[PDB]
Amino acid sequence: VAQISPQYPMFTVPLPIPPVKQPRLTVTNPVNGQEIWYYEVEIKPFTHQVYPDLGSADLVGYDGMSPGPTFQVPRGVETVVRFINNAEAPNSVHLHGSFSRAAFDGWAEDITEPGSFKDYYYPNRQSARTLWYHDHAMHITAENAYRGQAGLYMLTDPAEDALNLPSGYGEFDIPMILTSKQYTANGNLVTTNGELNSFWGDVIHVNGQPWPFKNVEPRKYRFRFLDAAVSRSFGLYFADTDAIDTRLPFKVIASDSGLLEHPADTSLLYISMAERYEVVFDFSDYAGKTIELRNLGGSIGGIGTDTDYDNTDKVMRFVVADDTTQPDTSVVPANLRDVPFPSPTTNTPRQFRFGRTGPTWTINGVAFADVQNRLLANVPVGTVERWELINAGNGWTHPIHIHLVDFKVISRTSGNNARTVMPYESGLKDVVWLGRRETVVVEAHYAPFPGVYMFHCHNLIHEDHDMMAAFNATVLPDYGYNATVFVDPMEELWQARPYELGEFQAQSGQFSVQAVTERIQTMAEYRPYAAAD
């Protein structure tokens, strides 16, 4: 299909890298004595230029940048972020991949209007993994993310750093935030408002950059891949600019929840919205040349339904250098980690069906906005449940995300005989792609925190209208751990707070180090994430 967005001079701009995020301070957690990093993220409108000739894009991002700044949080240390809505429409932040407490996870109605803020308290207790934070405000999540509200966040671990993979953000450890958008003639974004099926977009970006280049060295590299698009799934492969139809093969080191048990040797990476895979690519043998990362056309090989455009088969270009400026000491081992799969159950799976009821995308025929029927499962905490995710349709694809949890992919059956379980789905994830006529079952231990959590399709057009539901992690009244105050995401105690706007830049009022400090220490005392120890 012919491109709508103006013509772009491609592979002409070097790959941008989002800066890391700095905490404002630390606060002493009175329970254990440890400290707590505290960030302050403002959400403001800003204007950015993509088409080097004319026109700027009207955005709204985390700190006035899309993608928002990146978080490298060492495991163990609890972290806390204040999100300050200085924008034009409500917001609700989700840190995709953290088993936070219900009121810190980005419940779609737990929202912050402009002229207010809200503090999120994150445990940072899980395994090394790559996470991202995005808006989750009800029914406007597509457009809030489309315009810039998303970013990186890495739960790191020095133990696995003792594997000497290509290390170091920005040089051997590079982020790949894939989006797919569309622009006006004048240069501005075209709104996702009014789309009821999918917004594919005809312009491909990495780190907010349409069709860019990166010069590299003939050595192993770590690439972190994230499909942050609204509706587009990707089918990625590498090919030498001179046999563009030949797939260069690579190694997939980690999925959404972290490393797989063994590097998945592959040559084509199926990746849908919100999925994360980490790839290492030996640029060893391609010295001198110029490798191109491409996107599988034909609606991702008949897995999906995406509309392809003139230039949505190209993602970006890699220029290998003539020589390594210093040799490749980095390494990729063959055993990677022990993966804590959940102790298998044998029970019959719970069934969730993802379709539309007339014009509305539903799960088992209910729409998120339907408060009565929104809750579709009660799972007592500590339960393991297999869940069967069913896309019976031929004209829609559905990457299904479940909050709090990390699950193992048990099975996929494709009505189109298209595929079975893929080799990089052997570890742990929190998002699975239901392709055309696909049914998947996943297994996950529902632990360790009670609370009311979301699950939904991560096609933001679908999610917004209205393919999203809720499950309740249940305990008995004798449980404890203060759970009585962390199960309701709308708990009036963790809600947003108005702020006098100029007191934010003066660090007065609620932002004085002591108010900042009293509040966090107040917060810490509740021992929120203590059930994980």
Ligand X SMILES: *[C@@H]1O[C@H](CO)[C@@H](O[C@@H]2O[C@H](CO)[C@@H](O[C@@H]3O[C@H](CO)[C@@H](O)[C@H](O)[C@@H]3O)[C@H](O)[C@H]2NC(C)=O)[C@H](O)[C@H]1NC(C)=O
Ligand Y SMILES: *[C@@H]1O[C@H](CO)[C@@H](O[C@@H]2O[C@H](CO)[C@@H](O)[C@H](O)[C@H]2NC(C)=O)[C@H](O)[C@H]1NC(C)=O
Judged by CB, which is closer to ligand X: 243, or 476?
476
Is 205 annotated in a binding site? The answer is no
**What is the torsion angle, in degrees rounded to the nearest 10, for the CA atoms of residue 470, residue 122, residue 109 and residue 366?**
-20
Judged by CB, which is closer to ligand X: 111, or 291?
111
User: How far apart (Å, rounded) are the C-alpha atoms in residues 178 and 208?
Assistant: 8
Residue 148 zone, left/alpha/beta (φ > 0; ψ -120 to 50; rest): left
CA 94 to chain centre: 9
3-state class (DSSP) for residue 524? helix
- For ligand Y, the binding residue among 14, 30, 297, 327 (CB under 6 A) is 30
Is 456 annotated in a binding site? The answer is yes
> What's the closest the beta carbon of residue 531 comes to ligand Y, in angstroms?
9
The site partner of 526 among ligand Y, Cu ion, ligand X, none (C-beta below 5 to 8 Å per kind) is ligand Y
* Bridging pattern class, strands 383-390 and 314-320: unpaired
Judged by CB, which is closer to Cu ion: 251, or 398?
398
* 3-class DSSP string for 164-212: CCCCCECCCEEEEEEEEECECCCCCECCCCCCCCCCCCCEEEECCEECC
> What's the closest the beta carbon of residue 362 comes to ligand X, in angstroms?
20
482 binds ligand Y (CB under 6 A): yes
Judged by CB, which is closer to ligand X: 154, or 487?
487
Pick the stretch among 53-61, 296-304, 467-475, 480-488 that binds ligand Y (CB under 6 A): 480-488
The site partner of 459 among Cu ion, ligand Y, ligand X, none (C-beta below 5 to 8 Å per kind) is Cu ion
User: How far apart (Å, rounded) are the C-alpha atoms in residues 449 and 438?
Assistant: 31
Of all residues in the shown chain, the one whose CB is closest to ligand X is 472
Type of residue at 147: R
Residue pair 244/346 in contact by the 8 Å Cβ criterion: no
Pick the stretch among 181-189, 298-306, 355-363, 522-530 that binds ligand Y (CB under 6 A): 522-530
Is 467 annotated in a binding site? The answer is yes
> What's the closest the beta carbon of residue 237 comes to ligand Y, in angstroms?
50
User: How far apart (Å, rounded) are the C-alpha atoms in residues 220 and 373?
Assistant: 50
Is 445 annotated in a binding site? The answer is no
Is 139 annotated in a binding site? The answer is no
Is 465 annotated in a binding site? The answer is no
> What's the closest the beta carbon of residue 493 comes to ligand X, in angstroms?
14
- For ligand Y, the binding residue among 75, 139, 247, 527 (CB under 6 A) is 527
480 binds ligand Y (CB under 6 A): yes
Closest to 275 measured CA to CA, from 309, 322, 315, 224: 224
In DSSP terms, which residues pair with 453 in a beta bridge? 471
> What's the closest the beta carbon of residue 70 comes to Cu ion, in angstroms?
16
Type of residue at 530: A
Residues that bind ligand X (CB under 6 A): 375, 450, 452, 472, 474-475, 477, 479, 483-484, 487
The site partner of 30 among ligand Y, Cu ion, ligand X, none (C-beta below 5 to 8 Å per kind) is ligand Y
- For ligand Y, the binding residue among 31, 159, 392, 490 (CB under 6 A) is 31
User: Omega before 67 cis (within 30°)?
Assistant: yes
> What's the closest the beta carbon of residue 482 comes to ligand Y, in angstroms?
4
Q: What is the DSSP letter of 450?
A: -
Element (H, E) at 442: strand 438-446
The site partner of 19 among ligand Y, ligand X, Cu ion, none (C-beta below 5 to 8 Å per kind) is none
Q: b/e per residue, 114-125, with b = 16+ CB within 10 A? A: bebbbbbbbbbb
User: How far apart (Å, rounded) are the C-alpha atoms in residues 212 and 206?
Assistant: 7
* Binding-site residue set for Cu cation: 94, 96, 134, 136, 398, 401, 403, 456-458, 462, 467
Q: Which residues are annotated as a binding site?
A: 94, 96, 134, 136, 398, 401, 403, 456-458, 462, 467
Q: Which residues bind ligand Y (CB under 6 A)?
A: 30-31, 480-482, 525-527, 530
